[PDB]
């Protein structure tokens, strides 16, 4: 009697086990799977642009908004169009304006132009122009932040690009970081580095 | 002494499930996460996509040749492709502006009978499985509401709508609703059944 | 004594209950896990359907847009357009988005037939832009695929991987090896000749 439960938990322990392993392959499947979505939202959001800050207007249509644009452009660059889609989206406050470009090369001249002029206005007041990324990612840039200042203080020009990596100079040379583990095995190389962001990348 | 052995291990056994149990209804969250990002992501990537179904049965031109038939016969527009995927397959047909993809389809929808050298075909919206079988479950639903004077609306990506208090209320999933319908009396013992309470 | 033996009884008894009942749980979750990991690759293809892949493209610090789609051209006139898009990923390789598939897939013929593909004298690589799995379901048809080339059958792998050979004066196609498996039970000759392949 004593014996058969012995051996009852003895049987239990080793489902467990089993259960918690397979727990851990399941888990690295769900966490490949997040990361696939990841990349793919920021993949086709990639001609996409984000128009921050437009006077909302009584009865919108299609057509509206793309002249706005072209108000847009005309009053910004000069210098310098073809949209598969462009809409707003979906607090008190105007709705964002996502502008779905046919081709990728429009969205990034476009941001190129805007990054350059610096102050970017629609009848004088100022509206503002920016990459569409996946929350994920979106978050990703989110959590630099403190790194981020840390480095902006110090002179190392940081700077955050696609899809969330970081990159500043060092040794007269940008260095990129997909993540902060990467960054981590960077700054054990250069006790500066080590000692300034230690804290921050919570070693 | 050797009860007393097995009572610690039993003790920890308790508790590695339970922490195994949390585990596993967190995993199960992000799951469902992943399930409704995909099905998000997909009614995005086919806004500008449109179905021809029936169509008889192979190169781009002749396609694009067939769709203008389809027009000039039932529609009295920029393609950016066309192509296939006991009866003749489907074939997708991807705009170059979404508001194009969706002028033809109300227009296809008002028509009614889409037909192509007087045989019968269909133009339907490109949607997610997901989306798809969402929309025709708010079906049983959407009747009730029809019948009893709730002016009752499907919209994308699967929207239930009617009027409850003179107000226009949304309903993005059925859940949403049983949360909704459980404090109001009325239509609680009125989709109880419908919506598997 | 006796009347804890009786307490534990019931612990380790529903102890084991919560056990299969976990053990079930975890059996539907690998089944949604499966059907997000196969959706994923279906939209990945989807997707990365109009492009094309450039392998083996000497680097260059001075590259820039136009660079990359002359280099296109270039690769054209030494061996043989609308493009939505060209970029980088040992060389990275080039991803080439073309407005059509049809675009795409008459390169890539055209590099299968030609055989080799060259650039400035060197040899490059002309493949699909596909996910992971679609990708080795391709490999994975290899032995098979060879087998029916050497007994003329004349067989092709196209998108996402589906095999295609003709039988029977005919073109069949195959989804995956499960669909060749039932096609080959009625078809003695064929059956022995991929009876090993199929692992049958
Ligand atoms: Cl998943
Ligand atoms: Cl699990």
Redesign the interface.
């Known amino acids: 009697?004593?014996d058969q439960?012995?051996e009852?938990?003895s049987a239990?322990?080793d489902?467990?086990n089993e259960?918690?392993r397979?727990?851990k392959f399941?888990?690295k499947?769900?966490k490949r799977?997040?990361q696939?979505?990841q990349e793919?939202?920021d993949?086709?959001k990639r001609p996409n642009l984000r128009l921050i800050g437009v006077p909302e207007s009584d009865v919108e249509n299609?057509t509206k908004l793309e002249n706005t644009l072209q108000d847009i452009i005309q009053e910004n660059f000069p210098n310098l169009v073809?949209?598969?889609?462009i809409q707003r989206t979906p607090r008190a406050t105007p709705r964002h304006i996502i502008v779905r470009f046919?081709?990728?090369?429009m969205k990034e001249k476009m941001l190129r132009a805007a990054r350059e002029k610096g102050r970017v206005t629609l009848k004088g007041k100022p509206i503002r122009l920016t990459v569409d990324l996946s929350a994920e990612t979106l978050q990703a840039r989110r959590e630099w932040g403190p790194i981020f200042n840390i480095l902006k203080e110090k002179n190392f020009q940081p700077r955050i690009s696609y899809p969330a990596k970081l990159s500043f100079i060092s040794e007269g040379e940008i260095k990129y970081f997909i993540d902060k583990q990467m960054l981590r095995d960077f700054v054990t190389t250069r006790p500066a580095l080590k000692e300034l962001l230690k804290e921050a990348l919570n070693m």
Request: with cysteine; hydrophobic share 35%.
């Open positions: 009697r004593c439960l012995e009852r938990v239990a322990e489902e467990i259960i918690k397979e727990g399941r888990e499947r769900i799977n997040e696939s979505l793919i939202w993949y086709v299609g073809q949209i598969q889609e046919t081709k990728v090369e």
